[PDB]
Design a protein around this motif. Sequence first.
Motif, mmCIF file in Angstrom:
data_model
loop_
_atom_site.group_PDB
_atom_site.id
_atom_site.type_symbol
_atom_site.label_atom_id
_atom_site.label_comp_id
_atom_site.label_asym_id
_atom_site.label_seq_id
_atom_site.Cartn_x
_atom_site.Cartn_y
_atom_site.Cartn_z
ATOM 1 N N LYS C 1 36.661 22.395 63.951
ATOM 2 C CA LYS C 1 35.644 21.739 63.135
ATOM 3 C C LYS C 1 34.739 20.853 63.984
ATOM 4 C CE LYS C 1 37.277 19.551 59.644
ATOM 5 N NZ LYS C 1 38.385 18.941 58.861
ATOM 6 N N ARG C 2 34.750 21.086 65.292
ATOM 7 C CA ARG C 2 33.902 20.356 66.225
ATOM 8 C C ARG C 2 32.984 21.261 67.030
ATOM 9 N NH1 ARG C 2 34.779 15.914 69.577
ATOM 10 N NH2 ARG C 2 34.085 13.962 68.596
ATOM 11 N N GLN C 3 33.494 22.397 67.514
ATOM 12 C CA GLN C 3 32.731 23.349 68.323
ATOM 13 C C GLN C 3 32.128 22.647 69.544
ATOM 14 O OE1 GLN C 3 33.580 26.071 67.126
ATOM 15 N NE2 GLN C 3 33.772 25.811 64.904
ATOM 16 N N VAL C 4 33.040 22.170 70.388
ATOM 17 C CA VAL C 4 32.656 21.302 71.494
ATOM 18 C C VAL C 4 32.034 22.099 72.642
ATOM 19 C CG1 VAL C 4 34.163 19.381 70.879
ATOM 20 C CG2 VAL C 4 35.093 21.349 72.066
ATOM 21 N N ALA C 5 32.547 23.302 72.920
ATOM 22 C CA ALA C 5 32.111 24.286 73.933
ATOM 23 C C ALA C 5 32.213 23.801 75.397
ATOM 24 C CB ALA C 5 30.691 24.815 73.671
ATOM 25 N N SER C 6 32.530 22.529 75.650
ATOM 26 C CA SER C 6 32.692 22.011 77.007
ATOM 27 C C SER C 6 33.264 20.600 76.970
ATOM 28 C CB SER C 6 31.365 22.022 77.787
ATOM 29 O OG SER C 6 30.401 21.174 77.180
ATOM 30 N N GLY C 7 34.038 20.226 77.984
ATOM 31 C CA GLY C 7 34.607 18.891 78.009
ATOM 32 C C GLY C 7 35.476 18.650 79.222
ATOM 33 N N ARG C 8 36.181 17.524 79.176
ATOM 34 C CA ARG C 8 37.076 17.127 80.252
ATOM 35 C C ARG C 8 38.539 17.368 79.881
ATOM 36 N NH1 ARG C 8 34.388 11.295 81.604
ATOM 37 N NH2 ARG C 8 33.513 11.653 79.515
ATOM 38 N N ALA C 9 39.392 17.369 80.905
ATOM 39 C CA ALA C 9 40.835 17.484 80.716
ATOM 40 C C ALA C 9 41.528 16.531 81.675
ATOM 41 C CB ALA C 9 41.326 18.919 80.934
ATOM 42 N N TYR C 10 42.283 15.587 81.123
ATOM 43 C CA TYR C 10 42.986 14.575 81.894
ATOM 44 C C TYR C 10 44.465 14.924 81.948
ATOM 45 C CZ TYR C 10 38.802 11.625 81.637
ATOM 46 O OH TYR C 10 37.525 11.126 81.752
ATOM 47 N N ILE C 11 45.017 14.963 83.158
ATOM 48 C CA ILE C 11 46.425 15.271 83.382
ATOM 49 C C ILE C 11 47.096 14.002 83.891
ATOM 50 C CG2 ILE C 11 48.086 16.775 84.519
ATOM 51 C CD1 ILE C 11 45.912 18.830 84.874
ATOM 52 N N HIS C 12 47.935 13.392 83.055
ATOM 53 C CA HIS C 12 48.711 12.219 83.436
ATOM 54 C C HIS C 12 50.136 12.678 83.715
ATOM 55 C CE1 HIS C 12 51.251 8.658 82.898
ATOM 56 N NE2 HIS C 12 50.199 7.935 83.234
ATOM 57 N N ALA C 13 50.520 12.675 84.988
ATOM 58 C CA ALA C 13 51.823 13.159 85.418
ATOM 59 C C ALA C 13 52.633 12.012 86.001
ATOM 60 C CB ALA C 13 51.681 14.283 86.447
ATOM 61 N N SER C 14 53.887 11.906 85.572
ATOM 62 C CA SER C 14 54.835 10.937 86.099
ATOM 63 C C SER C 14 56.119 11.669 86.464
ATOM 64 C CB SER C 14 55.106 9.814 85.088
ATOM 65 O OG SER C 14 55.647 10.334 83.884
ATOM 66 N N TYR C 15 57.114 10.912 86.918
ATOM 67 C CA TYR C 15 58.413 11.487 87.236
ATOM 68 C C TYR C 15 59.314 11.616 86.016
ATOM 69 C CZ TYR C 15 57.542 11.380 92.249
ATOM 70 O OH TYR C 15 57.041 11.613 93.510
ATOM 71 N N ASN C 16 58.856 11.170 84.845
ATOM 72 C CA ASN C 16 59.600 11.335 83.606
ATOM 73 C C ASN C 16 58.920 12.257 82.606
ATOM 74 O OD1 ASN C 16 61.467 9.519 84.629
ATOM 75 N ND2 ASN C 16 60.606 7.758 83.533
ATOM 76 N N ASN C 17 57.633 12.547 82.782
ATOM 77 C CA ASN C 17 56.900 13.374 81.832
ATOM 78 C C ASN C 17 55.542 13.728 82.421
ATOM 79 O OD1 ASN C 17 56.045 14.774 79.593
ATOM 80 N ND2 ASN C 17 56.479 13.129 78.127
ATOM 81 N N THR C 18 54.931 14.763 81.849
ATOM 82 C CA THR C 18 53.553 15.140 82.132
ATOM 83 C C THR C 18 52.848 15.398 80.809
ATOM 84 O OG1 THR C 18 54.032 16.096 84.313
ATOM 85 C CG2 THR C 18 52.035 16.844 83.183
ATOM 86 N N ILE C 19 51.661 14.820 80.639
ATOM 87 C CA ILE C 19 50.902 14.963 79.404
ATOM 88 C C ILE C 19 49.465 15.325 79.754
ATOM 89 C CG2 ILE C 19 51.702 12.557 79.280
ATOM 90 C CD1 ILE C 19 48.952 12.182 78.905
ATOM 91 N N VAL C 20 48.851 16.140 78.899
ATOM 92 C CA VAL C 20 47.487 16.619 79.087
ATOM 93 C C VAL C 20 46.676 16.261 77.851
ATOM 94 C CG1 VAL C 20 46.021 18.632 79.369
ATOM 95 C CG2 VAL C 20 48.151 18.454 80.659
ATOM 96 N N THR C 21 45.534 15.610 78.062
ATOM 97 C CA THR C 21 44.619 15.245 76.988
ATOM 98 C C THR C 21 43.278 15.917 77.239
ATOM 99 O OG1 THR C 21 45.689 13.126 76.514
ATOM 100 C CG2 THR C 21 43.377 13.371 75.882
ATOM 101 N N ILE C 22 42.864 16.784 76.319
ATOM 102 C CA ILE C 22 41.594 17.493 76.409
ATOM 103 C C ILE C 22 40.579 16.774 75.533
ATOM 104 C CG2 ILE C 22 40.406 19.672 76.025
ATOM 105 C CD1 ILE C 22 42.800 21.155 76.767
ATOM 106 N N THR C 23 39.445 16.406 76.131
ATOM 107 C CA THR C 23 38.472 15.486 75.563
ATOM 108 C C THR C 23 37.067 16.054 75.725
ATOM 109 O OG1 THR C 23 37.320 13.414 76.044
ATOM 110 C CG2 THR C 23 38.788 14.287 77.732
ATOM 111 N N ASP C 24 36.095 15.365 75.139
ATOM 112 C CA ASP C 24 34.700 15.791 75.139
ATOM 113 C C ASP C 24 33.942 15.140 76.288
ATOM 114 O OD1 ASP C 24 34.112 13.119 74.157
ATOM 115 O OD2 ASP C 24 34.742 13.863 72.185
#
Lengths: 155, 70, 116
Positions: C1-24
């Motif tokens: 419901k956004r149709q962003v077509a392009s953006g950023r992706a932040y990879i926060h990696a630690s020694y206990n977990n890795t998380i990825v946040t995809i943003t505009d």
Amino acid sequence: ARRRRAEVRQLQPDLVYGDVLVTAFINKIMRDGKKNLAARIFYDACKIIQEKTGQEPLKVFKQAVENVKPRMEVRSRRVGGANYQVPMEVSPRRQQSLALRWLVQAANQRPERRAAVRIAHELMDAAEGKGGAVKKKEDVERMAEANRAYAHYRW
Amino acid sequence: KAKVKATLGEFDLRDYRNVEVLKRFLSETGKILPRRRTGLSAKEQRILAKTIKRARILGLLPFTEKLVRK
Amino acid sequence: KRQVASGRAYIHASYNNTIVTITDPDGNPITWSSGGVIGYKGSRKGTPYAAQLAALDAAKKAMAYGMQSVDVIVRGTGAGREQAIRALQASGLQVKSIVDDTPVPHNGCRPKKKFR
RNA sequence: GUGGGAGAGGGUGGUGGAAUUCCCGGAGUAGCGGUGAAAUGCGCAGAUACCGGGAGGAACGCCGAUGGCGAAGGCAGCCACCUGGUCCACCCGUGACGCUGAGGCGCGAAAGCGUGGGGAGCAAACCGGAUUAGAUACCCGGGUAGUCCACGCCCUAAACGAUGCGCGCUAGGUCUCUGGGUCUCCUGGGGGCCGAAGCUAACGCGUUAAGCGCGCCGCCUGGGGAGUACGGCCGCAAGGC
Ligand SMILES: [Mg+2]
Ligand SMILES: [Mg+2]
Ligand SMILES: [Mg+2]
Ligand SMILES: [Mg+2]
Ligand SMILES: [Mg+2]
Ligand SMILES: [Mg+2]
Ligand SMILES: [Mg+2]
Ligand SMILES: [Mg+2]
Ligand SMILES: [Mg+2]
Ligand SMILES: [Mg+2]
Ligand SMILES: [Mg+2]
Ligand SMILES: [Mg+2]
Ligand SMILES: [Mg+2]
Ligand SMILES: [Mg+2]
Ligand SMILES: [Mg+2]
Ligand SMILES: [Mg+2]
Ligand SMILES: [Mg+2]
Ligand SMILES: [Mg+2]
Ligand SMILES: [Mg+2]
Ligand SMILES: [Mg+2]
Ligand SMILES: [Mg+2]
Ligand SMILES: [Mg+2]
Ligand SMILES: [Mg+2]
Ligand SMILES: [Mg+2]
Ligand SMILES: [Mg+2]
Ligand SMILES: [Mg+2]
Ligand SMILES: [Mg+2]
Ligand SMILES: [Mg+2]
Ligand SMILES: [Mg+2]
Ligand SMILES: [Mg+2]
Ligand SMILES: [Mg+2]
Ligand SMILES: [Mg+2]
Ligand SMILES: [Mg+2]
Ligand SMILES: [Mg+2]
Ligand SMILES: [Mg+2]
């Protein structure tokens, strides 16, 4: 093998086919040092498998052993506490050995009364893509693709 | 590899305003380059560091940057 | 419901977990994922395979939002800090550029006893 | 004296960015965190991650070194001001004015005390979660004093080069910091490393002496008892001599 490579024993060829895998399988059937009785088992099974299905036992034997050879397996590796199951590929020689061992062990775990009958029907099922030996092979392969999360522990 | 002083003119190590030549002594990031890559003497490097910090506080040189291709 | 077509992706990696946040392109997030969002619960979240699966799940949610071109930002260090970027490359998203923006202080705060 | 020089030497005021925490807002779901595994913990009152804004404290990444400065403790962002020590060249001035130094006086990391501020992060005590035969510990989550500042005390230390200060004499080689020079190099003055002679119980020291000499101060005389007792002095106390 601490020092040497433990050079592989080169089995004698076979008297009926002239092929070495047949001699290896006949050795895998032999127990208590009876290669004569084991050869009779394998060749009466050859007659039975060539009659009950009108194909050459040569290529059915080859296709069955080829169908049972797995492509991956698991080995335990000690890392950070208790060891883990790490998947990896297989050597061709070890594939041969494991295939023949699963063949014999699934043949003798069959209900059939006579030994040659068990051998023949086991070879048939393995040549068709089903049976017990192929089930053990596919369980070995199912160990892979499952603990693949440890694909960085290959060693 | 080339050291910075090897490819350069007869420039002022005490000019905090010349960003064109002070930029050569920063890394891909905003970090000051060691003497291995600047080809400077101890005294020269000691003066360059203070001039670089002066330029930084004047918003001319970056305090820090972002690494690429990582 | 956004149709962003392009953006950023932040990879926060630690020694206990890795998380990825995809943003505009102006910073607001679109989707995200982590080793806990997917099945893994304990230290299993810190494995490179969990990082790969998290990156892939976030990338597919971005596909649901309609993401094609992605710029990558990386902060932190851990197992699978690279595997996340490899899966993100082969996920079907054309990687625009990869950037390591790991925040490092100028010696401001005193660390915990573990870090000294 | 003149003329140059290097420096986290000290004090005062200002000032910069990164990061943590917290607050406001945007967007955004279901976990985050943490460990050898975990759990306490935090999250639907919207966390974590991402973006923008604000507040506050503390410490100064790269430069940075095996470097520099200081009598020692010790001293790292940048700027300005106030100020100490020191080195070199000139061979200018005074003309033995020197060295050491019981006592005294001053300085003296951290922790600790008192009064008043300050408080992000860390964190004795403490509160919980685990681990274990038990856990009063190591590991995890919180958390007060404290850490920070002003002023006044405290006078300890592996306060270490475990090597008191000063001067003269006794092969060199190599790396280095900083000056001067007619600048493959030489000549001072600091920081290291090998190693002559010699020294040493040996390890090792070796122009930065633990060598050869001289001056002066401090200290030692088997271990435990014991840096304890008594006495005195100092201290708000802890306690110190
Ligand atoms: Mg974890
Ligand atoms: Mg200073
Ligand atoms: Mg100062
Ligand atoms: Mg918010
Ligand atoms: Mg809740
Ligand atoms: Mg809860
Ligand atoms: Mg609640
Ligand atoms: Mg506050
Ligand atoms: Mg350093
Ligand atoms: Mg001065
Ligand atoms: Mg004269
Ligand atoms: Mg005269
Ligand atoms: Mg004196
Ligand atoms: Mg005295
Ligand atoms: Mg003190
Ligand atoms: Mg103190
Ligand atoms: Mg106090
Ligand atoms: Mg804490
Ligand atoms: Mg307990
Ligand atoms: Mg704690
Ligand atoms: Mg003496
Ligand atoms: Mg010179
Ligand atoms: Mg000195
Ligand atoms: Mg010297
Ligand atoms: Mg020397
Ligand atoms: Mg000798
Ligand atoms: Mg020596
Ligand atoms: Mg001497
Ligand atoms: Mg001696
Ligand atoms: Mg004594
Ligand atoms: Mg005695
Ligand atoms: Mg005592
Ligand atoms: Mg007393
Ligand atoms: Mg009294
Ligand atoms: Mg005491």
